[PDB]
Ligand binder design. Structure first.
Ligand SMILES: O=C(O)CC[C@H](NC(=O)c1ccc(S(=O)(=O)N2CCC[C@@H]2C(=O)O)cc1)C(=O)O
Ligand SMILES: O=C(O)CC[C@H](NC(=O)c1ccc(S(=O)(=O)N2CCC[C@@H]2C(=O)O)cc1)C(=O)O
Lengths: 261, 262
């Protein structure tokens, strides 16, 4: 996508060499922002074929508050396999904080239900937020949240969302993360009778791993294609009732998938 | 400052006319990002006189974990007065979350100390973060955090920081918030023997209140002066041991103050 390819080029040109916790290098930058007007098309990278199937199952899994990979396993989505313990558990990662953030008195807070009620009853609210950054639960997680904090906003009947991503793997994670939040905006907009607005992406530590450099060079030699259009085929009773078969992507004409280690 | 006036101009050119929680109208945009290279000078707005005195006292108060206005009130800082209850309490706002976020199992996490240690021992960490957004306690607070989430980054011996401000009062709040975090970057850099890098400001709901519009256009008719300079005169034993008198600003020559209604 244009913005996505300018970000890759900027990391290559301006990133500083760093050594992560695995001893693998990265070129990284700090602080970046991109804006996707969702009325211009669904923001699925076209410079490499992305597989929406895994993006869709992961988001649905998030919304159910499940942190066990079984459901992902049942549908052949393997992106979380390496973090899962012997029982397939991840600890209280994304989903559990979105649906049941634990409070000290033993209660739980459902941020998604709060957000839907804020969108329907107080759309101008300046605090329509979901945070996965539960400081007191970080040590229990297989991984601290990367896409960690998001906010919704309503103007002229359009629903926008901004994500603060504290850590971004530009080649492998980003394409997935942008599509995931664009997807969520379409679903929330539908449940709230709103049109779609902008998806604003903000990055903190934004990096390209050293073993993604051939792939990055290959991807940057390709020209982006017009964005596809997302179709929701059925409007469920609630934001927790979507199914994989409800989504269709039309006009998606990507360059070939690019594998990365 | 150039970045600040450009943001004012962006809110005026693109903003959507809305109504704040109290009705008082707002002009707002959603999503914005700007950067201040702290070696260029301390980012204290020059197009209106700002008092750094209040900004300094508030930051030392945050760093102590204090949520009562007594300290501020004693030092003639009244910016939090309208939110305090009859005993001066604000609930577990900013400072409490920064220094003692309560976990489900009964522990408390001191996020400032955690960040200080991560900067000294693992400066390339990608999770050098402080969050004031404690979902479980937001409704006990007198106000939910505006400057809600921030992250540190280290490159070429310089310390940078990015703030996610979910709600921004551009005219009244912003000048204070920018100087506040820039001061905090200086203090942390001093404690870990680093140089200052950039302060990255990101906005969520970024608005100008309708009764700040003439003050905003008055400010927009002025030219930004050269940035002042920050001189810290001592190196305390910890990030929690700074004193008001340890900070001096030099070369601050602003245009005249502009009062406005909160
Ligand atoms: O689509 C598929 O089935 C997977 C194909 C493969 N994707 C990835 O490895 C991939 C995709 C997303 C991610 S992620 O950043 O959203 N993410 C989810 C798993 C943990 C990880 C994180 O935060 O570190 C991490 C890795 C790719 O080449 O895109
Ligand atoms: O010096 C003084 O007493 C303040 C005078 C005045 N400043 C402001 O009103 C001002 C300063 C800071 C803020 S703030 O956004 O940082 N903030 C701190 C008080 C509660 C408020 C909030 O979260 O809503 C909000 C307003 C100014 O002209 O800068």
């Amino acid at each position: 996508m244009k913005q996505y390819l300018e970000l890759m080029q900027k990391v290559l040109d301006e990133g500083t060499q760093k050594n992560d916790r695995t001893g693998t290098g990265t070129l990284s930058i700090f602080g970046h922002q991109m804006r996707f007007n969702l009325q211009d098309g669904f923001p699925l990278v076209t410079t490499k074929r992305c597989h929406l199937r895994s993006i869709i199952h992961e988001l649905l899994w998030f919304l159910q508050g499940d942190t066990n990979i079984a459901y992902l396993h049942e549908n052949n989505v393997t992106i979380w396999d390496e973090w899962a313990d012997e029982n397939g558990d991840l600890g209280p990662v994304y989903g559990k904080q979105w649906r049941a953030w634990p409070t000290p008195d033993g209660r739980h807070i459902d941020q998604i239900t709060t957000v839907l009620n804020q969108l329907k009853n107080d759309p101008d609210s300046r605090r329509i937020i979901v945070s996965a950054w539960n400081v007191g639960e970080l040590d229990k997680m297989a991984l601290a949240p990367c896409h960690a904090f998001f906010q919704f906003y309503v103007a002229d009947g359009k629903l926008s969302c901004q994500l603060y991503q504290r850590s971004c793997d530009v080649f492998l994670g980003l394409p997935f993360n942008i599509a995931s939040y664009a997807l969520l905006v379409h679903m929330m907009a539908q449940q709230c009778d709103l049109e779609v607005g902008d998806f604003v992406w903000t990055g903190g530590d934004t990096h390209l791993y050293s073993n993604h450099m051939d792939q990055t060079h290959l991807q940057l030699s390709r020209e982006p294609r017009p964005l596809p259009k997302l179709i929701i085929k059925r409007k469920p009773e609630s934001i927790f009732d979507y199914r994989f078969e409800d989504f269709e992507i039309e006009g998606y004409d990507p360059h070939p998938g690019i594998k990365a280690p």
